[PDB]
Design a protein around this ligand. Structure first.
Ligand code: HEM
Length: 110
């Protein structure tokens, strides 16, 4: 099965390398990138991200709900376009299918 957990870890490395300030919105604010895997707040968030990806592939993702929740953290279209780029890099690094359509689905509600 596609190792989405590893893809998601690479995604967040890419995301926070390019936009370190995004990390401030999370419960693992301040934590060195090389330590995220040892952080409990990160483990939970990465698991939810993997779940969302499996839901988008499986046909049950609530893109409108996810978008609304990100607006509720003042995260919008700009951040998601950055995320789309980072996730495309992470997918390609693992020979995984691209998730651009799923991110487009979220973007359509932002
Ligand atoms: C590929 C794009 C992304 C996906 C699939 C994704 C997915 C998720 C998921 C599944 C949750 C949990 C929602 C829930 O518990 O109901 C979440 C929460 C969150 N996301 Fe994202 N996200 C993405 C990008 C971003 C970006 C770019 C930011 C920018 C800072 C961000 C900030 C947040 C924040 C602050 C929360 C709340 C975390 C908390 O409760 O401590 N997300 N995201």
């Amino acid at each position: 099965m596609v190792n989405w957990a590893a893809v998601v870890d690479d995604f967040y490395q890419e995301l926070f390398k390019a936009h370190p300030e995004y990390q401030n919105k999370f419960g693992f604010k301040g934590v060195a990138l090389g330590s995220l895997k040892g952080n409990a707040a990160y483990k939970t968030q990465a698991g939810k991200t993997v779940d969302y990806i499996n839901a988008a592939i499986g046909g049950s993702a609530d893109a409108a709900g996810l978008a609304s929740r990100h607006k509720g953290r003042n995260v919008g279209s700009a951040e998601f376009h950055n995320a789309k780029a980072c996730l495309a890099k992470a997918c390609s690094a693992h020979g995984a299918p691209d998730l651009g359509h799923a991110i487009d689905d979220i973007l359509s509600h932002l």
